[PDB]
Amino acid sequence: VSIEQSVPQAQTMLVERHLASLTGDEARLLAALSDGSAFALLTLYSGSRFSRGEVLYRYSNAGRAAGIQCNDFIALYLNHLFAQGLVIASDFTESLRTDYELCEGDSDFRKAQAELQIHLPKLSIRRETLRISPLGRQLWTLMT
Amino acid sequence: EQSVPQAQTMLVERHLASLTGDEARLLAALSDGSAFALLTLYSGSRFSRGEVLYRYSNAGRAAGIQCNDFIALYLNHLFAQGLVIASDFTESLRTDYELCEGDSDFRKAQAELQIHLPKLSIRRETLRISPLGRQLWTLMTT
Amino acid sequence: SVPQAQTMLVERHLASLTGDEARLLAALSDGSAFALLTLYSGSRFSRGEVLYRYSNAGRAAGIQCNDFIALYLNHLFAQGLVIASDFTESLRTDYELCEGDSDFRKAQAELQIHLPKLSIRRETLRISPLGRQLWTLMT
């Protein structure tokens, strides 16, 4: 028998694996989403608005309010938060119009879009809304 | 500089090392060839499903799950790690899909999601080990 | 001085990216494009999600263990570091070759049992903007 050091509970493993493993910037983004706040999201889809196909790239200005260190990595951060099931995308929010415009004007986003258009000629921007997912909320609650 | 044995160890580690007891047991069951009921919530309707928003299974004791509270989290992880697939509806899982659809946690997740995604749809699916899951299992058991 | 946030991100990948995946990213970062076969769900009521991907980038990319190509592709796509574009006429022979490879046909046969409308898409593997950015950070 060897139990002096404790094997962690499922709960603990879940929060270590999905939240403690986040980079500080990712964690700050999730924090900003945790009270239900919604942010502007631009999603690049492989096809046009009459046949969207798959999600290729995501961009937001939520990093600014969230206080992230390196806003240059926002698309990388969002890819991870989505891949991990921690956030969701929903439809356009009229009140975020100004934010979409700020995002669409960003030079890094425009660069990414131009790279993707070379080979995906029908690529389209879709204005969406970023929120915490049920799974992200469940994990957040376990952690707190 | 990385050797082949180190690549293999890194692959096994990165996909399999963080599993809970429940997940390790479920994956073992799936590696035997067993399949279980899966209920998936999609952001769009049946002709344009969009993105996966939530997955639920009543796998329970038969799959070795102690903590039914975390089944959506476990499925989320196992899919993210490429370890499992969702195949089509299986008739023989009929009564399990009914159990899933009745479940309280499932229904709550659905209602939350519906607030902001009103075209949301439910699909009955079948959870099985993926080809990558099978390869990794074998690499791991060497 | 490198920003903290950059170090954290780079370290994540240094701990999880294999030599072979690193070499594959590098080949792609040059602008190289490879044959990709994608098995996906062919039911009109599914999202048509990817079930398996295969390529013969192989020696071209400097892959030491071609046994692991499907695992590498799964990881590179999950991490958003590569994209799949349309069929490239130039790669026709490569597509024919991939379609006949053992590992591909085995995965295909496994999946076919349970996914009778299993479909195959011939596509082209390229780096994504995220892949360019990360690979630049890491190098």
Chain C interface includes A3 (CB < 8 A): no
**DSSP one-letter code for C3:** -
CA distance A5 to chain B (A): 17
Closest to C70 (Cβ–Cβ): which among B7, B126, B131?
A: B131
CB neighbours of A78 closer than 8 A, spacing ≥ 6? A29, A41, A58, A59, A60, A87, A130
**DSSP one-letter code for C88:** -
**Pairwise CB contact (< 8 Å): A76 & C126:** no
CA distance B84 to chain C (A): 9
**Pairwise CB contact (< 8 Å): A23 & C5:** yes
Query: Is the separation of the CB atoms in C114 and C12 below 8 Å?
Result: no
Pairing, β C119-127 against β C34-40: antiparallel
Query: What are the distances in angstroms from CA B70 to CA A93, A135, B10, B73?
Result: 31, 10, 27, 5
SS3 at position C117: coil
Query: Measured between alpha carbons, how far is A41 from A128 in angstroms, rounded to an integer?
Result: 5
Query: Mind listing the domains of chain A with CATH numbers?
Result: 1-144 (3.30.110.190)
- Which ranges of A96-133 does DSSP label H, i.e. alpha helix? 97-105, 107-119
Phi-psi label, residue C58: left if phi above 0, alpha if psi -120 to 50, beta otherwise? left
Resolution, given in Å to one decimal, reads 2.2
Chain C interface includes A111 (CB < 8 A): yes
Q: Which residues of C touch B1 (CB under 8 A)?
A: 19
Q: Which residues of B touch A33 (CB under 8 A)?
A: none
The structure tokens listed for A117 are: 């258009």
**Pairwise CB contact (< 8 Å): B116 & A91:** yes
Identify the bridge partners of residue B31 per DSSP, sorted by sequence position.
Answer: none
- DSSP of A22-66, one letter per residue? S-HHHHHHHHHHTTS--EEEEEEESS-TTS---EEEEE-SHHHHH
Query: Measured between alpha carbons, how far is B120 from B117 in angstroms, rounded to an integer?
Result: 6
Query: Measured between alpha carbons, how far is A108 from A105 in angstroms, rounded to an integer?
Result: 9
**DSSP one-letter code for A8:** P
Query: Measured between alpha carbons, how far is A58 from A78 in angstroms, rounded to an integer?
Result: 6
Residue of A89, A83, A78, A79 lying closest to A126 (CA atoms): A89
Closest to C65 (Cβ–Cβ): which among B7, B51, B134?
A: B7
Query: Is the separation of the CB atoms in A57 and A45 below 8 Å?
Result: no
Chain A interface includes C3 (CB < 8 A): yes
**Pairwise CB contact (< 8 Å): A120 & C12:** no
Chain C interface includes B87 (CB < 8 A): yes
**Pairwise CB contact (< 8 Å): A135 & B76:** yes
Q: What is the 3-state secondary structure (H, E, C) of C26-75?
A: HHHHCCCCEEEEEEECCCCCCCCCEEEEEECCHHHHCCCCHHHHHHHHHH
